[PDB]
């Protein structure tokens, strides 16, 4: 009740945090930990409300709308001057149900990396790749790898035209309100097929083919972010990292990730931790204390932003952030993933249609709470005889109707798809491709 307990992942500063925490405690006689255990973000949810949690929690905000749902961390209200000490789409990253619920440290998104030795003018648009590619060709090796299997590393593409997750306004995300079906979306994913019909990129690539590729100097660009740097510092290839390509003279507009520190809500040094977090991390000296142990990449705060953003790879990080969308902290975010990644991955290979891909997904991440639901019903049933899977329809409350279609029902498979249809009946098709996507899976 007279300390401060600080969690942060292993692969961060905690050294450089704990110096923070040093000079916090020479100043005011308050011990301050830091710890980095295994699993934290799991832990998390299940010390917290309890005895032995941490005061502030370090992770991605992407978590922090999971925390806060259920709880867990201290609505934060700082002064308007400090509120303008960082960039203001930041805290847009930790803000949930219109409340603040941690503070932005750093900031992370896809950057386009590139071989100066191959290519010291990289293409400012993805309409150049194509042609440059044919160059590059005669030469044996190509323009541009990344990975095509993670809708992550293809969305900042697809997301360029006017594509979004969900909608985001006045501090709220609309989950009805998805921009996987609209006109730029469907634009910038034919411009992926076609990179691929014309062989200018493989629909098998992935993350690992993408890294050896441009690490062994085969290719020319790859886009990925802070995280891969190092190995790229061990390659021994001349390398920079750039805006992204724009598409229709638009912006391609990754995800952004922002790293967060929350404040417990069953902490009794909430006052403490607003004075820590506010006071000495959020400086000049405390970032750069923990830049020092390990690298925050961009970072939140716009004095010492403008000092990092002097190395060019810092500045192209943090513009593409800005120009990019912040990862919706949502737990409907998971029908999007999959949804999309699906669509992507069906585009590449020809096996749907652009058109039929994102109509698809459209209509799963629009309907995620009822996916979510039939899933989870699917999953339960197929582990079921025919016969338990029918006494499962009656303890769900089924009525006789269904019921009698259940009783004709000769597999598990159809009893499944007849009760999601009971529950939600205007959507047959969607609970079909439920059904048959958790039995594809088991």
Same mark, same amino acid.
């Given at each position: 009740?007279?300390?401060?307990?600080?969690? $942060?992942?292993?692969?961060?500063?905690?050294?450089?945090?704990?110096?923070?925490?040093?000079?916090?405690?020479?100043?005011?006689?308050?011990?301050?930990?830091?710890?980095?255990?295994?699993?934290?973000?799991?832990?998390?949810? /299940?010390?917290?409300?309890?005895?032995?949690?941490?005061?502030?929690?370090?992770?991605?905000?992407?978590?922090?709308?999971?925390?806060?749902?259920?709880?867990?961390?201290?609505?934060?209200?700082?002064?308007? +001057?400090?509120?303008?000490?960082? !960039?203001?789409?930041?805290?847009?990253?930790?803000?949930?149900?219109?409340?603040?619920?941690?503070?932005?440290?750093?900031?992370?998104?896809?950057?386009?990396?590139?071989?100066?030795?191959?290519?010291?003018?990289?293409?400012?648009?993805?309409?150049?790749?194509?042609?440059?590619?044919?160059?590059?060709?005669?030469?044996?090796?190509?323009?541009?790898?990344?990975?095509? /299997?993670?809708?992550?590393?293809?969305?900042?593409? $697809?997301?360029?035209?006017?594509? !979004?997750?969900?909608?985001?306004?006045?501090?709220?995300?609309?989950?009805?309100?998805?921009?996987?079906?609209?006109?730029?979306?469907?634009?910038?994913?034919?411009?992926?097929?076609?990179?691929?019909?014309?062989?200018?990129?493989?629909?098998?690539?992935?993350?690992? $083919?993408?890294?050896?590729?441009?690490?062994?100097?085969?290719?020319?660009?790859?886009?990925?972010?802070?995280?891969?740097?190092?190995?790229?510092?061990?390659?021994?290839?001349?390398?920079?990292?750039?805006?992204?390509?724009?598409?229709?003279?638009?912006?391609?507009?990754?995800?952004?990730?922002?790293?967060?520190?929350?404040?417990?809500?069953?902490?009794?040094?909430?006052?403490?931790?607003?004075?820590?977090?506010?006071?000495?991390?959020?400086?000049?000296?405390?970032?750069?204390?923990?830049?020092?142990?390990?690298?925050?990449?961009?970072?939140?705060?716009?004095?010492?932003?403008?000092?990092?953003?002097?190395?060019?790879?810092?500045?192209?990080?943090?513009?593409?952030?800005?120009?990019?969308?912040?990862?919706?902290?949502?737990?409907?975010?998971?029908?999007?993933?999959?949804?999309?990644?699906?669509?992507?991955?069906?585009?590449?290979?020809?096996?749907?249609?652009?058109?039929?891909?994102? +109509?698809?997904? /459209?209509?799963? +991440?629009?309907?995620?709470?009822?996916?979510?639901?039939?899933?989870?019903?699917?999953?339960?049933?197929?582990?079921?005889?025919?016969?338990?899977?029918?006494? !499962?329809?009656?303890?769900?409350?089924?009525?006789?109707?269904?019921?009698?279609? $259940?009783?004709?029902?000769?597999?598990?498979?159809?009893?499944?798809?007849?009760?999601?249809?009971?529950?939600?009946?205007?959507?047959?098709?969607?609970?079909?491709?439920?059904?048959?996507?958790?039995?594809?899976?088991?």
């Amino acid at each position: 009740e007279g300390k401060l307990v600080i969690w $942060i992942n292993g692969d961060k500063g905690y050294n450089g945090l704990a110096e923070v925490g040093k000079k916090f405690e020479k100043d005011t006689g308050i011990k301050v930990t830091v710890e980095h255990p295994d699993k934290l973000e799991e832990k998390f949810p /299940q010390v917290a409300a309890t005895g032995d949690g941490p005061d502030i929690i370090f992770w991605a905000h992407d978590r922090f709308g999971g925390y806060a749902q259920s709880g867990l961390l201290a609505e934060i209200t700082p002064a308007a +001057a400090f509120q303008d000490k960082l !960039y203001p789409f930041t805290w847009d990253a930790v803000r949930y149900n219109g409340k603040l619920i941690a503070y932005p440290i750093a900031v992370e998104a896809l950057s386009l990396i590139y071989n100066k030795d191959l290519l010291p003018n990289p293409p400012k648009t993805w309409e150049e790749i194509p042609a440059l590619d044919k160059e590059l060709k005669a030469k044996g090796k190509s323009a541009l790898m990344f990975n095509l /299997q993670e809708p992550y590393f293809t969305w900042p593409l $697809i997301a360029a035209d006017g594509g !979004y997750a969900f909608k985001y306004a006045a501090g709220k995300y609309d989950i009805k309100d998805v921009g996987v079906d609209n006109a730029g979306a469907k634009a910038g994913l034919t411009f992926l097929v076609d990179l691929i019909k014309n062989k200018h990129m493989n629909a098998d690539t992935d993350y690992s $083919i993408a890294e050896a590729a441009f690490n062994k100097g085969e290719t020319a660009m790859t886009i990925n972010g802070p995280w891969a740097w190092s190995n790229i510092d061990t390659s021994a290839v001349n390398y920079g990292v750039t805006v992204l390509p724009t598409f229709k003279g638009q912006p391609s507009k990754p995800f952004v990730g922002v790293l967060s520190a929350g404040i417990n809500a069953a902490s009794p040094n909430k006052e403490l931790a607003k004075e820590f977090l506010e006071n000495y991390l959020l400086t000049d000296e405390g970032l750069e204390a923990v830049n020092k142990d390990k690298p925050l990449g961009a970072v939140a705060l716009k004095s010492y932003e403008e000092e990092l953003a002097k190395d060019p790879r810092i500045a192209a990080t943090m513009e593409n952030a800005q120009k990019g969308e912040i990862m919706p902290n949502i737990p409907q975010m998971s029908a999007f993933w999959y949804a999309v990644r699906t669509a992507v991955i069906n585009a590449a290979s020809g096996r749907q249609t652009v058109d039929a891909a994102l +109509a698809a997904a /459209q209509t799963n +991440a629009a309907a995620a709470d009822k996916v979510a639901v039939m899933a989870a019903m699917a999953r339960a049933a197929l582990e079921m005889s025919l016969e338990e899977a029918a006494q !499962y329809a009656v303890e769900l409350g089924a009525g006789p109707e269904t019921l009698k279609r $259940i009783r004709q029902a000769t597999s598990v498979r159809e009893v499944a798809i007849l009760i999601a249809i009971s529950w939600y009946p205007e959507n047959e098709e969607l609970a079909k491709k439920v059904v048959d996507r958790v039995l594809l899976e088991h």
